Structure formats: structure tokens, C-alpha cells
Amino acid sequence: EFTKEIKDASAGLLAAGFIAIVPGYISRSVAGSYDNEAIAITLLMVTFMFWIKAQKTGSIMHATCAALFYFYMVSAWGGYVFITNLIPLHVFLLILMGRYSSKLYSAYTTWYAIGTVASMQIPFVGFLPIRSNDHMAALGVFGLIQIVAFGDFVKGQISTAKFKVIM
Amino acid sequence: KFGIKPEIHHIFHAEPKRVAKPIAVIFVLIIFITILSLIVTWLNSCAAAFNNIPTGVTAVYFLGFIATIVGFEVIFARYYLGTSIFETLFSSLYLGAPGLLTSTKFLRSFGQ
Amino acid sequence: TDFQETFKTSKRAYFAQIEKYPKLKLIDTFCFFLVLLGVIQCTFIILIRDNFPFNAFLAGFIICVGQFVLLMSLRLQLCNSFPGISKNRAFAEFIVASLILHFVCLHFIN
Amino acid sequence: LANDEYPRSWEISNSWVYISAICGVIVAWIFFVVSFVTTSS
Amino acid sequence: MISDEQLNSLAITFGIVMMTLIVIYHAVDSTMSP
Ligand SMILES: *[C@@H]1O[C@H](CO)[C@@H](O[C@@H]2O[C@H](CO)[C@@H](O[C@@H]3O[C@H](CO[C@H]4O[C@H](CO)[C@@H](O)[C@H](O[C@H]5O[C@H](CO)[C@@H](O)[C@H](O)[C@@H]5O)[C@@H]4O)[C@@H](O)[C@H](O[C@H]4O[C@H](CO)[C@@H](O)[C@H](O)[C@@H]4O[C@H]4O[C@H](CO)[C@@H](O)[C@H](O)[C@@H]4O[C@H]4O[C@H](CO)[C@@H](O)[C@H](O)[C@@H]4O)[C@@H]3O)[C@H](O)[C@H]2NC(C)=O)[C@H](O)[C@H]1NC(C)=O
Ligand SMILES: CCCCC/C=C\C/C=C\CCCCCCCC(=O)O[C@H](COC(=O)CCCCCCCCCCCCCCC)COP(=O)([O-])OCC[N+](C)(C)C
Ligand SMILES: CCCCC/C=C\C/C=C\CCCCCCCC(=O)O[C@H](COC(=O)CCCCCCCCCCCCCCC)COP(=O)([O-])OCC[N+](C)(C)C
């Protein structure tokens, strides 16, 4: 489904056929292996699939069920931190390139809202996403996405010669 | 060696103080005055009032819609006081299955 | 370069944009009083010196920040609609997102 | 202590502000959805 | 129960049937799509 969101589905079946039997994932996915990365990658790919599917169309629902599988990815594995430094790294690279839209706001800001009020309920991860140095990229991009939203309101309303002296 | 030994009583940790209570009462009715300011701003004063009410045969899907929206907050409000996660989960299942059909025929009935 | 044209001009565009569409009035005044509840809780944490539960503060605070977030994410879909998403599908997703945020914030208040 | 066997949020004198504000956002949300549906744009 | 060489033949024949019908799907898709 992820590669179906990147290209046509005929590349999705190649990616599924690759990751079904690849030796890099079958190492940590052997038959007797209850070692907590058996459930991690099957939530990394559902998380990323609903994130890309939420950022294409700008839907609120796909970015809330991206955050439910983000929460259920936090409940499982301790390398959830990767996601909360990759989805903000994606959105931020969407800001520097000038590819901001209302879809990118309307996806990211509800991903951060639901996914950060929800991942705080696991007792191993307490108020750490408020005061850890690795969850600050998400609160930083959640910070400046407001400024790009309001600035994006004033750029499309005042003329270009006064708009060039703003950014 | 043998003989009597001095006692030990395990001096406990101190708990941080809670709050002065009428300060908390003051902020409770400040938030009450703010929410009542919101409702009194909505209903008549800013004229964002009830322009249309579907009094036809699609009124029952509107009352079903209010039954779902108020119903999930009744379920969550019961979950706030006791009421373990499984009985809440079957409660919102038994509301969410008939309730999603009568909250979608309504939004099919209104194209705005 | 005093930016006197900015606040007056955007004041005319926004302040003209409010009463032409009756639903954006609901959205932005409800956003404004959400900002007032965030300010009231923040000055409660300033007025006394402790944040003693600290899950109650982030419960009552992240419900207001998150609800403001979902309201802006609906106003952006009513002002200029997204391609694959209708205006009625713009609203049910707000309802589902708001009910999920209300559940997690009533779980996090304990 | 279990997660249930804690001092409750309505019991504690400090958390009345946040219960009142969460209840305010919820009731104002219910009048927001009923007022939003029943208005005409 | 199945042996280990017979499981090796089963795993390899699922891999070969898998990649074969993937290539057939990609050929039929790439030829007959606008
Ligand atoms: C990871 O695992 C680790 C290993 O399993 C674990 O580490 C261990 O943790 C425990 C728990 O804290 C440690 O026990 C404490 O150790 C203290 C160290 O004191 C040193 O220095 C003192 C002089 O400054 C020495 O007296 C002391 O003991 C020596 O003498 C003993 C008798 O002669 C002898 O057996 C020893 O081998 C050693 O030679 C040591 O060298 C120690 O001070 C402390 O004792 C107090 O607490 C005990 C109960 O916890 C009481 O039984 C004891 O009598 C002392 O009580 C005082 O404190 C209580 C409250 O804490 C009060 O209720 C008492 O009334 C009393 O209070 C008096 O003193 C207070 C000042 O301290 C004062 O405020 C009061 O008013 C009153 O005057 C205890 O034994 C242990 O040492 C650690 N071991 C190692 C190897 O590190 C670690 O905890 C684990 N990690 C986690 C996260 O759990
Ligand atoms: C529009 C529809 C909206 C419906 C909303 C429904 C869900 C919202 C989505 C996400 C919410 C996230 C918050 C988690 C709440 C549950 C915690 C709980 O249940 O444990 C709580 C205790 O907490 C905890 O220790 C933390 C436990 C963390 C749970 C870890 C499991 C996650 C993985 C589950 C997936 C399993 C496979 C399923 C595959 C799909 C028990 O509570 P209790 O039984 O004591 O109840 C009494 C309620 N007092 C106490 C408030 C009165
Ligand atoms: C999502 C699709 C899933 C795709 C495949 C998934 C997993 C396959 C991977 C590994 C499988 C290897 C098997 C290891 C165990 C060895 C046992 C063995 O080999 O049995 C062999 C024989 O078997 C067979 O003739 C197989 C028979 C036909 C198989 C039919 C497929 C089952 C599906 C039916 C479901 C229909 C319902 C439809 C619902 C919609 C004998 O063994 P025995 O001597 O121990 O019997 C004990 C000795 N008696 C004989 C005396 C009892």
C-alpha cells in the first residue's frame, strides 16, 4: 500500500515480493522470535502508509488514523523516535522547497495533535515528548507550521513587492 | 554483639502542597463565565442563530445525529468516572454501529 | 515602511470575510475563546508556582491546542475545498478527530 | 500503587480548573456542532 | 511432519511462483494501460 501511494500498484507488488523474503527483515523476524521488532515494522509501514495517504489528499481522517497507528507503534517498540524525527523532517523539507499548501498543514498539525496527546499515555513514555531533545523537532515544526500558515495568509493578500520584504 | 539495638522508623518522603482551594474556585467560575460568554455570543448577540431547522421527515436523522454526538460524550463521561475500558469499548461499539448509519443518511440529506 | 496598509488591508479582507459566510463566524470566534482558555490555564500555572498533577495541565491545555488545530483544519477546507474531499466529508472527519481528542484528553486527566 | 489507586482528579483541589475547562470545551463543542449544522450558509 | 529439504523446496517454489506472477502482472499492466 505504501509503494502504491508512491507509484502505481505494479511497483507495490514488487515491494511486497521483496520485503516478504528479504534477508534483512527475516533476521529479526525468524519463526521463534517474540523480540518486539516482529510488531514494529508492520506498524512502521502502516504508519508511513497513512502518513503519505494523509499528506497527498490532505484528509483529517487519514492523519488521525496515522496517529492511531503511531500510538500503537509507540506501545510496541522503543524506536518510535525515528517516526517523530522523520515525519517532521519531511514536512520541514516541504517548507524549505516552497511546496506548502493547506493539505500539508491539515495533515501535519492533526497528526501532531492526536499523535502527541496519545503517545503520552504509555507509562514508559511519560511527559518525555514534552521535555526530551528528540521530540523537539516535532514541536518545532508544529511551531513554525503556524507561522507558515499565517504568513501564507498574508502573502496571498498583499502585493508581491511588499511580499518579497516579508520572508 | 548481642543485646539491644537502636530503633529505626523510616522517615518518609514529603508530599508537595496541593493548592489554596478558593483560588481554584475562582478560576472554576472564571472558566464558567468564559463558556457562558461563548454561548451568549453564539445564540443571539452575534446573529449566528438557527436559520433553518429540518422540520421534514429528515428530522429523525437529525435527532439520530444528536444522539450520536451527545452519545459519545455520555460514553466518555461515564468512562471518566469508573467504568472500565472494555465496557466503554462495547458501549461505543453498540452505539457506533447503528449510529454511523443514521449520522450519514443525515449528511447525505444535507448538501451544503 | 510602517506597515499601516497591512493591518488595515488584511483587516478589510478578513473582517469582510467574516460576515459573508455565517459558518466562519462560528469557527473563528470558537477559536478565539479556545485561545482564552489556553491563556486562563497558563496564567493559573503562572499565578501559583507549582504544576502538581502535570497531566491535568497538559490534558486541559492539549484539548484546547488540539481543538484549535482541528478547527483551523476545517476552516481551510471550507474556505477553499480540497479536491477529493467534499464539504460534508470535510466535517465528519472533524467530528471523528474531535471525539478521539476528547477521549484521549478525558483519559489523560485521570 | 496501581493506576486506579491514586488520588482522583475531582478529589484533588488543584485539578478543578482543568476539569472545568475540559467540560467547557466539550459543551461548547456540542453547541458548535449543533449550531454549525443548524445554521444556513 | 514435513522435513527440512522439503521445506526448502516449498519456500523456493513459493518464491518462484511469487516472482513469476509478479512479472506476469507487470507485463499485462504495462502493456494494456493508458
Ligand atoms: C541498585 O542496586 C544497588 C545494590 O543492590 C542499590 O544500592 C543500595 O541502595 C541502598 C538504599 O539506599 C543503600 O542503603 C543505604 O546506604 C547508605 C550508605 O551509607 C554509607 O555511609 C554511611 C556513613 O555515612 C555508613 O553508615 C553506611 O553503612 C556502613 O555501616 C553499616 C553499619 O556499620 C555497615 O553495615 C555498612 O556495610 C557500612 O559499612 C554506608 O557506608 C546508608 O546510609 C543507608 O542507611 C540508612 O538507611 C537504612 C534504611 O534504608 C537504615 O537501616 C540505616 O540505619 C540508615 O537509616 C537512616 O536513614 C533512614 C531513612 O533513609 C532513617 O529512617 C533512619 O532513621 C536513619 O536516619 C538517620 O540518618 C539520616 C542521614 O542518613 C538522618 O537524616 C536521620 O535524621 C537519622 O539521623 C542505607 O543503608 C545501599 O548502601 C546501596 N548499596 C550499594 C552497593 O550501592 C540501589 O538502591 C539500586 N538502585 C535502585 C534504583 O533501587
Ligand atoms: C469516534 C470514536 C471515538 C472512540 C475513542 C476510542 C479510542 C481512542 C483511540 C486511542 C486512545 C489511546 C489511549 C489508550 C486508552 C486505553 C488504555 C487502558 O485501557 O488502560 C487503562 C489504564 O491506562 C494505562 O495504564 C495505560 C495502558 C496503555 C495501553 C497499551 C495497549 C495499546 C495497544 C492496544 C492494541 C491491541 C490490538 C488491537 C488491534 C487494533 C485502564 O483503564 P480502566 O480499565 O481502569 O478504566 C477506568 C478508567 N479510569 C481509571 C479513568 C476510571
Ligand atoms: C494466506 C494463505 C496461507 C498460505 C500458506 C501458509 C503457510 C504455509 C507454510 C508452511 C506449511 C508447512 C506445513 C508444516 C506442518 C507439516 C504437516 C504436513 O506436512 O502434513 C502432511 C500432509 O499434508 C497434506 O497433505 C496437506 C493437505 C492439503 C492442504 C489444504 C490446505 C489447508 C487450507 C484449508 C482451509 C479451507 C477453508 C477456507 C476458508 C475460507 C502429513 O504430515 P503428518 O505425517 O505429520 O500427519 C500425521 C499423519 N496422518 C497423515 C496419519 C494424519
XYZ file of C-alpha atoms and ligand atoms in Angstrom:
662
model
C 0.000 0.000 0.000
C 2.915 2.376 0.668
C 4.550 1.773 -2.714
C 1.063 2.010 -4.246
C 0.964 5.517 -2.789
C 4.367 6.347 -4.279
C 3.983 4.810 -7.774
C 1.393 2.539 -9.421
C 0.395 -0.745 -7.756
C 2.633 -2.824 -10.048
C 5.585 -1.465 -8.070
C 3.697 -2.223 -4.870
C 3.679 -5.908 -5.716
C 7.429 -5.774 -6.384
C 7.972 -4.131 -2.992
C 5.743 -6.683 -1.266
C 7.551 -9.519 -3.018
C 10.880 -8.037 -1.969
C 10.087 -7.493 1.712
C 8.285 -10.832 2.086
C 11.511 -12.830 1.705
C 14.334 -10.299 2.176
C 17.183 -11.470 4.469
C 17.423 -8.100 6.239
C 13.980 -8.451 7.827
C 13.892 -12.244 8.160
C 16.879 -11.890 10.509
C 14.763 -10.129 13.129
C 11.599 -11.938 12.024
C 12.521 -15.655 12.437
C 9.822 -18.171 13.432
C 10.667 -18.216 17.093
C 11.322 -14.521 17.713
C 8.994 -12.653 20.043
C 11.599 -9.918 20.391
C 9.487 -6.781 19.894
C 10.527 -5.913 16.329
C 8.121 -8.519 14.999
C 5.318 -5.984 15.519
C 7.421 -2.850 14.945
C 7.897 -2.770 11.166
C 4.324 -3.840 10.397
C 3.359 -0.622 12.234
C 6.148 1.480 10.731
C 4.759 0.742 7.276
C 1.104 1.241 8.237
C 2.089 4.486 9.996
C 4.002 5.698 6.946
C 1.265 4.479 4.600
C -1.395 6.530 6.359
C 1.025 9.446 6.584
C 1.680 9.556 2.835
C -2.008 8.868 2.205
C -2.767 11.736 4.623
C -0.314 14.187 3.072
C -1.345 13.577 -0.545
C -5.058 14.298 -0.174
C -4.879 16.430 2.971
C -7.529 14.424 4.782
C -8.074 14.835 8.511
C -9.182 11.209 8.943
C -6.077 9.666 7.384
C -3.912 11.833 9.629
C -5.852 10.726 12.703
C -5.567 7.053 11.817
C -1.945 7.777 11.037
C -1.760 8.893 14.673
C -3.612 5.847 15.998
C -1.041 3.576 14.379
C 1.625 5.980 15.583
C 0.316 5.437 19.124
C 0.086 1.693 18.564
C 3.631 1.875 17.218
C 4.697 3.645 20.444
C 3.013 0.934 22.568
C 5.215 -1.691 20.890
C 8.760 -0.581 20.117
C 11.236 1.884 21.570
C 12.408 3.116 18.195
C 9.253 5.136 17.656
C 11.542 8.191 17.957
C 12.540 7.656 14.312
C 8.970 8.454 13.224
C 8.862 11.588 15.362
C 12.030 12.748 13.651
C 11.078 11.722 10.095
C 7.520 12.981 9.545
C 8.657 16.395 10.916
C 11.761 16.168 8.707
C 9.520 15.538 5.694
C 7.152 18.457 6.409
C 10.091 20.795 7.072
C 11.616 19.884 3.709
C 8.209 20.668 2.250
C 8.558 24.129 3.820
C 12.056 24.948 2.546
C 11.237 23.965 -1.037
C 8.203 26.249 -1.194
C 5.718 23.380 -1.529
C 3.479 24.423 1.371
C -0.265 24.013 0.970
C -3.361 23.634 3.106
C -3.107 19.850 2.733
C 0.306 19.849 4.402
C -0.964 21.932 7.316
C -4.247 19.986 7.602
C -2.298 16.704 7.694
C 0.690 17.503 9.906
C -0.968 19.569 12.601
C -3.623 16.956 13.408
C -1.004 14.195 13.217
C 0.934 16.047 15.909
C -2.151 16.875 17.982
C -3.641 13.374 18.164
C -0.325 11.531 17.959
C 1.313 13.510 20.745
C -1.618 13.588 23.145
C -1.977 9.836 22.506
C 1.649 8.643 22.718
C 1.923 10.268 26.158
C -0.382 7.636 27.687
C 2.155 4.795 27.629
C 3.726 4.780 31.123
C 7.228 4.079 29.791
C 6.931 7.304 27.760
C 5.578 9.837 30.207
C 5.994 13.567 29.732
C 9.176 12.817 27.773
C 7.639 14.130 24.468
C 7.272 17.483 26.251
C 10.837 17.679 27.569
C 13.147 15.408 25.564
C 15.613 16.653 22.967
C 14.481 14.151 20.311
C 10.782 15.092 20.358
C 11.632 18.775 19.804
C 11.734 18.507 16.019
C 8.022 17.702 16.023
C 7.141 20.573 18.338
C 9.409 22.865 16.334
C 7.792 22.017 13.004
C 4.417 22.209 14.762
C 5.593 25.633 15.898
C 6.628 27.063 12.542
C 3.754 25.494 10.578
C 1.537 28.086 12.286
C 3.859 30.860 11.086
C 3.904 29.461 7.548
C 0.097 29.216 7.696
C -0.469 32.830 8.789
C 2.339 34.145 6.601
C 0.789 32.129 3.785
C -2.417 34.029 4.517
C -0.713 37.422 4.216
C 1.389 36.567 1.132
C -1.700 35.750 -0.934
C -3.423 39.016 0.031
C -0.779 41.789 -0.194
C 1.140 42.556 -3.405
C 4.424 40.940 -4.430
C 6.772 43.900 -3.831
C 5.616 44.076 -0.206
C 5.594 40.262 -0.062
C 9.274 39.946 -1.010
C 10.288 42.011 2.040
C 8.460 39.569 4.359
C 10.228 36.207 4.002
C 27.260 -8.193 69.512
C 24.022 -9.423 71.149
C 21.989 -7.008 73.262
C 19.537 -4.251 72.403
C 19.811 -2.149 69.229
C 18.544 1.372 68.431
C 15.219 1.701 66.651
C 14.577 2.767 63.041
C 11.330 4.423 61.923
C 11.816 5.197 58.164
C 11.239 8.949 57.888
C 9.007 9.211 54.820
C 9.086 11.496 51.798
C 7.194 14.782 51.834
C 4.216 15.390 49.564
C 4.008 18.694 47.655
C 1.202 21.023 48.704
C -1.914 20.987 46.584
C -3.409 24.484 46.263
C -5.380 27.015 48.212
C -8.944 25.883 47.469
C -10.925 29.167 46.904
C -8.341 30.246 44.303
C -9.309 27.098 42.402
C -12.976 28.003 42.927
C -12.254 31.472 41.476
C -10.696 30.038 38.316
C -13.539 27.499 38.008
C -16.165 30.189 37.796
C -13.900 32.328 35.574
C -13.907 29.446 33.074
C -17.676 29.160 33.633
C -18.088 32.859 32.774
C -15.955 32.361 29.645
C -18.015 29.404 28.368
C -21.269 31.220 29.147
C -19.783 34.184 27.258
C -19.250 31.841 24.300
C -22.849 30.624 24.315
C -24.287 34.122 24.791
C -22.065 35.286 21.931
C -23.381 32.496 19.687
C -27.096 32.209 20.211
C -28.460 35.737 19.678
C -25.945 38.559 20.066
C -23.690 37.885 17.072
C -26.723 36.725 14.990
C -25.219 33.325 14.117
C -28.521 31.786 15.176
C -30.730 28.965 13.885
C -31.564 29.992 10.330
C -33.045 26.643 9.255
C -34.282 23.585 11.134
C -35.116 20.452 9.095
C -38.738 20.003 10.192
C -39.445 17.417 7.461
C -39.155 13.635 7.525
C -35.364 14.008 7.718
C -35.714 15.334 11.277
C -35.336 11.825 12.701
C -31.857 11.502 11.203
C -31.016 14.853 12.784
C -32.157 13.588 16.186
C -30.133 10.459 15.485
C -27.161 12.718 14.754
C -27.585 14.486 18.106
C -27.961 11.024 19.668
C -24.540 10.042 18.333
C -22.733 13.294 19.152
C -24.180 13.573 22.656
C -23.993 9.779 22.965
C -20.226 9.513 22.600
C -19.769 12.267 25.177
C -22.072 10.412 27.566
C -19.949 7.289 26.976
C -16.711 9.210 27.561
C -18.227 10.955 30.590
C -19.149 7.589 32.087
C -15.611 6.417 31.288
C -14.241 9.360 33.269
C -15.904 8.074 36.462
C -15.099 4.385 36.921
C -16.394 2.226 34.061
C -13.516 0.026 32.785
C -12.225 0.303 29.204
C -13.955 -2.845 27.940
C -17.497 -1.818 28.878
C -16.803 1.621 27.386
C -15.455 -0.077 24.256
C -18.507 -2.308 23.816
C -20.667 0.729 24.634
C -19.159 2.783 21.803
C -19.349 -0.283 19.575
C -23.064 -0.740 20.312
C -23.566 2.981 19.689
C -21.128 3.261 16.791
C -22.691 0.546 14.668
C -26.321 1.877 14.405
C -25.124 5.408 14.960
C -22.845 5.688 11.939
C -25.724 4.827 9.602
C -28.069 7.476 11.000
C -25.250 10.056 11.038
C -24.505 9.516 7.340
C -28.019 9.440 5.883
C -28.336 12.844 7.552
C -25.184 14.194 5.910
C -26.410 12.702 2.643
C -29.645 14.626 3.188
C -27.792 17.967 3.541
C -25.692 19.093 0.606
C -24.130 22.393 1.678
C 7.508 51.179 5.905
C 5.238 51.497 8.947
C 3.026 48.540 7.828
C -0.135 50.622 8.237
C -1.504 49.174 4.990
C -1.008 45.590 6.211
C -3.267 45.570 9.276
C -5.932 47.765 7.675
C -5.907 45.887 4.354
C -5.953 42.424 5.934
C -8.495 43.862 8.380
C -10.725 44.649 5.392
C -10.204 41.242 3.763
C -10.666 39.194 6.950
C -13.296 41.443 8.551
C -15.192 41.442 5.267
C -14.699 37.662 5.038
C -16.374 37.012 8.423
C -19.977 38.123 7.874
C -20.200 36.991 4.244
C -20.080 33.323 5.350
C -22.013 32.614 8.584
C -20.091 29.437 9.485
C -16.622 31.017 9.554
C -18.020 33.290 12.274
C -18.635 30.189 14.426
C -15.198 28.813 13.591
C -13.110 31.876 14.362
C -14.931 33.043 17.495
C -14.763 29.481 18.846
C -11.034 29.508 18.049
C -10.725 32.829 19.876
C -12.301 31.612 23.092
C -10.152 28.471 22.881
C -7.196 30.869 22.946
C -8.762 32.497 26.029
C -8.974 29.126 27.804
C -5.320 28.475 26.984
C -4.434 31.877 28.448
C -6.529 31.242 31.596
C -4.847 27.888 32.263
C -1.394 29.307 31.513
C -1.935 32.167 33.969
C -3.192 29.646 36.511
C 0.166 27.879 36.170
C 1.873 31.268 36.471
C -0.274 32.624 39.350
C 0.564 29.706 41.632
C 4.047 28.263 41.468
C 3.503 24.515 41.023
C 2.063 22.289 38.309
C 1.249 19.484 40.691
C -0.623 16.821 38.624
C 1.009 17.957 35.330
C -1.197 15.537 33.435
C -4.197 17.710 34.258
C -2.399 20.761 32.849
C -1.481 19.037 29.606
C -4.957 17.487 29.490
C -6.810 20.803 29.682
C -4.127 22.500 27.571
C -3.722 19.977 24.746
C -7.513 19.741 24.403
C -7.559 23.477 23.601
C -4.489 23.459 21.347
C -5.672 20.316 19.567
C -9.225 21.578 19.171
C -7.935 24.884 17.764
C -5.802 22.820 15.368
C -8.796 20.807 14.153
C -10.907 23.949 13.749
C -8.295 25.592 11.538
C -8.004 22.323 9.620
C -11.749 22.538 8.951
C -11.781 26.264 8.112
C -9.099 25.694 5.474
C -11.363 23.024 3.928
C -14.480 25.214 3.922
C -12.838 28.379 2.580
C -11.243 26.597 -0.401
C -12.206 22.940 -0.655
C -9.742 20.108 -1.184
C -10.056 18.153 -4.487
C -11.019 14.661 -3.407
C -12.868 15.809 -0.283
C -16.396 17.218 -0.213
C -17.580 19.826 2.265
C -19.632 17.179 4.075
C -16.614 14.867 4.234
C -14.693 17.906 5.493
C -16.910 17.881 8.601
C -17.391 14.231 9.597
C -13.606 13.836 9.737
C -13.540 16.818 12.102
C -16.171 15.071 14.227
C -14.182 11.816 14.405
C -10.940 13.700 15.118
C -12.630 15.747 17.842
C -14.150 12.698 19.536
C -10.779 10.927 19.540
C -9.140 14.024 21.048
C -11.894 14.244 23.673
C -11.405 10.600 24.641
C -7.629 10.889 24.972
C -7.964 14.119 26.951
C -10.530 12.532 29.291
C -8.181 9.577 29.727
C -5.230 11.876 30.389
C -6.998 13.960 33.047
C -7.479 10.678 35.021
C 0.322 1.773 43.801
C -1.923 0.706 40.950
C -3.040 3.210 38.334
C -6.529 3.154 39.865
C -5.310 3.585 43.457
C -4.224 7.219 43.073
C -5.799 10.427 44.413
C -8.556 11.214 41.964
C -8.728 14.344 39.796
C -12.020 15.526 41.285
C -10.709 14.734 44.778
C -7.641 16.955 44.444
C -8.191 20.674 44.955
C -5.799 21.725 42.175
C -7.422 19.961 39.194
C -10.848 21.611 39.380
C -9.690 24.227 36.861
C -8.818 21.643 34.227
C -11.935 19.506 34.700
C -13.972 22.703 34.360
C -12.077 23.714 31.217
C -12.303 20.279 29.573
C -16.028 20.254 30.365
C -16.281 23.759 28.911
C -14.552 22.767 25.660
C -16.790 19.695 25.372
C -20.093 21.533 25.956
C -19.009 24.407 23.696
C -18.089 21.756 21.118
C -21.587 20.236 21.272
C -23.176 23.639 20.743
C -20.613 24.186 17.975
C -21.719 21.110 16.039
C -25.459 21.682 16.597
C -25.102 25.400 15.822
C -22.916 24.629 12.795
C -25.393 22.152 11.334
C -28.495 24.232 12.061
C -27.161 27.444 10.522
C -27.575 28.286 6.834
C -24.649 29.415 4.688
C 5.719 -33.747 9.582
C 7.445 -32.111 6.603
C 11.240 -32.396 6.519
C 13.785 -29.603 6.076
C 14.800 -30.246 2.458
C 11.108 -30.449 1.582
C 10.539 -27.155 3.393
C 13.411 -25.695 1.359
C 11.682 -26.856 -1.826
C 8.404 -25.368 -0.564
C 9.973 -21.993 0.274
C 11.805 -21.788 -3.049
C 8.722 -22.761 -5.051
C 6.651 -20.096 -3.282
C 9.389 -17.614 -4.169
C 9.489 -18.642 -7.839
C 5.691 -18.681 -8.219
C 5.606 -15.303 -6.422
C 8.162 -13.554 -8.651
C 6.778 -15.235 -11.784
C 3.225 -13.996 -11.312
C 4.562 -10.574 -10.243
C 6.363 -10.316 -13.601
C 3.226 -11.520 -15.433
C 1.131 -8.880 -13.639
C 3.642 -6.174 -14.511
C 3.743 -7.199 -18.179
C -0.051 -7.299 -18.531
C -0.306 -3.987 -16.667
C 2.465 -2.201 -18.591
C 1.218 -3.333 -21.998
C -2.501 -2.618 -21.519
C -2.597 0.622 -19.520
C -3.008 4.202 -20.833
C 20.607 -0.811 42.648
O 21.167 -1.828 43.442
C 22.001 -1.327 44.497
C 22.580 -2.533 45.200
O 21.642 -3.599 45.276
C 21.212 -0.409 45.433
O 22.179 0.279 46.214
C 21.906 0.226 47.619
O 20.840 1.114 47.987
C 20.533 1.127 49.389
C 19.328 2.019 49.564
O 19.702 3.387 49.638
C 21.756 1.593 50.173
O 21.468 1.538 51.565
C 21.799 2.778 52.225
O 23.191 3.041 52.204
C 23.589 4.263 52.856
C 25.076 4.418 52.632
O 25.660 4.946 53.808
C 27.084 4.734 53.746
O 27.768 5.662 54.574
C 27.386 5.681 55.984
C 28.233 6.739 56.668
O 27.987 7.982 56.024
C 27.543 4.274 56.619
O 26.910 4.284 57.892
C 26.886 3.198 55.700
O 26.901 1.833 56.247
C 28.125 1.396 56.879
O 27.880 0.946 58.200
C 26.986 -0.197 58.332
C 26.843 -0.496 59.808
O 28.090 -0.229 60.435
C 27.549 -1.383 57.532
O 26.623 -2.451 57.568
C 27.799 -0.953 56.074
O 28.330 -2.036 55.325
C 28.709 0.271 56.002
O 29.981 -0.164 56.485
C 27.358 3.313 54.220
O 28.761 3.071 54.180
C 23.197 4.179 54.352
O 23.482 5.405 54.986
C 21.699 3.850 54.499
O 21.384 3.641 55.885
C 20.178 4.335 56.282
O 19.009 3.710 55.766
C 18.689 2.355 56.223
C 17.350 2.067 55.672
O 17.369 2.397 54.290
C 18.731 2.269 57.760
O 18.684 0.915 58.153
C 20.020 2.912 58.290
O 20.049 2.822 59.704
C 20.118 4.346 57.819
O 18.891 4.906 58.277
C 18.883 6.335 58.179
O 18.027 6.766 57.131
C 16.626 6.396 57.252
C 15.895 6.975 56.069
O 16.699 6.786 54.922
C 16.081 6.912 58.590
O 14.774 6.459 58.763
C 16.956 6.384 59.728
O 16.429 6.807 60.976
C 18.394 6.838 59.540
O 18.311 8.247 59.550
C 19.424 8.808 60.258
O 20.382 9.271 59.349
C 19.878 10.201 58.351
C 21.017 10.534 57.417
O 21.263 9.397 56.597
C 19.288 11.440 59.057
O 18.653 12.264 58.099
C 18.264 10.990 60.135
O 17.757 12.115 60.838
C 18.867 9.955 61.088
O 19.906 10.641 61.778
C 21.313 2.627 53.662
O 21.931 1.509 54.279
C 22.937 0.684 49.859
O 24.113 1.153 50.508
C 23.187 0.621 48.354
N 24.267 -0.306 48.061
C 25.175 -0.097 47.103
C 26.218 -1.158 46.947
O 25.152 0.899 46.392
C 20.388 0.626 44.667
O 19.432 1.219 45.539
C 19.648 0.007 43.484
N 19.016 1.039 42.682
C 17.728 1.376 42.803
C 17.245 2.460 41.891
O 16.987 0.831 43.612
C -15.343 8.392 17.301
C -14.987 7.169 18.168
C -14.040 7.528 19.342
C -13.627 6.281 20.170
C -12.362 6.516 21.033
C -11.615 5.195 21.339
C -10.279 5.130 21.332
C -9.411 6.377 21.024
C -8.066 5.999 20.368
C -6.935 5.882 21.078
C -6.908 6.110 22.602
C -5.484 5.926 23.190
C -5.484 5.836 24.739
C -5.389 4.366 25.238
C -6.520 4.034 26.255
C -6.525 2.544 26.697
C -5.623 2.313 27.940
C -6.325 1.455 29.029
O -7.374 0.960 28.808
O -5.698 1.254 30.286
C -6.237 1.997 31.340
C -5.077 2.407 32.245
O -4.167 3.152 31.457
C -2.863 2.609 31.388
O -2.393 2.084 32.340
C -2.058 2.703 30.068
C -2.223 1.440 29.181
C -1.769 1.656 27.711
C -2.473 0.667 26.738
C -1.476 -0.142 25.867
C -2.193 -1.013 24.790
C -2.181 -0.358 23.381
C -2.281 -1.393 22.226
C -3.727 -1.911 22.029
C -3.955 -2.593 20.654
C -4.292 -4.099 20.803
C -4.654 -4.792 19.472
C -5.818 -4.085 18.745
C -5.634 -4.044 17.213
C -6.496 -2.954 16.543
C -7.208 1.126 32.136
O -8.442 1.811 32.254
P -9.617 1.160 33.239
O -9.982 -0.225 32.767
O -9.117 1.089 34.664
O -10.971 2.116 33.182
C -11.202 3.006 34.257
C -10.979 4.438 33.709
N -10.428 5.306 34.788
C -9.265 4.846 35.577
C -10.029 6.576 34.151
C -11.536 5.486 35.745
C -2.758 -16.900 3.473
C -2.581 -18.258 2.763
C -1.589 -19.189 3.506
C -0.561 -19.832 2.541
C 0.282 -20.944 3.216
C 0.641 -20.599 4.679
C 1.578 -21.282 5.340
C 2.358 -22.450 4.689
C 3.742 -22.621 5.351
C 4.145 -23.791 5.867
C 3.248 -25.044 5.826
C 4.066 -26.338 6.085
C 3.290 -27.366 6.955
C 4.114 -27.814 8.196
C 3.394 -28.932 9.004
C 3.590 -30.335 8.367
C 2.255 -31.126 8.271
C 2.145 -31.896 6.926
O 3.010 -31.811 6.122
O 1.008 -32.711 6.672
C 1.259 -33.824 5.859
C 0.177 -33.922 4.779
O -0.208 -32.603 4.419
C -1.093 -32.517 3.311
O -1.253 -33.457 2.606
C -1.847 -31.197 3.005
C -3.350 -31.427 2.693
C -3.981 -30.300 1.826
C -3.742 -28.871 2.393
C -5.012 -27.982 2.316
C -4.713 -26.501 2.703
C -5.380 -26.088 4.045
C -6.372 -24.898 3.900
C -7.852 -25.344 4.037
C -8.782 -24.201 4.525
C -10.151 -24.207 3.799
C -11.172 -23.238 4.442
C -11.455 -21.994 3.564
C -11.696 -20.719 4.407
C -12.144 -19.516 3.554
C 1.258 -35.085 6.730
O 2.033 -34.814 7.888
P 1.944 -35.841 9.192
O 2.643 -37.134 8.845
O 2.613 -35.201 10.389
O 0.346 -36.137 9.540
C 0.030 -37.043 10.586
C -0.168 -38.459 9.974
N -1.545 -38.675 9.415
C -1.457 -38.481 7.954
C -1.890 -40.077 9.726
C -2.688 -37.858 9.883
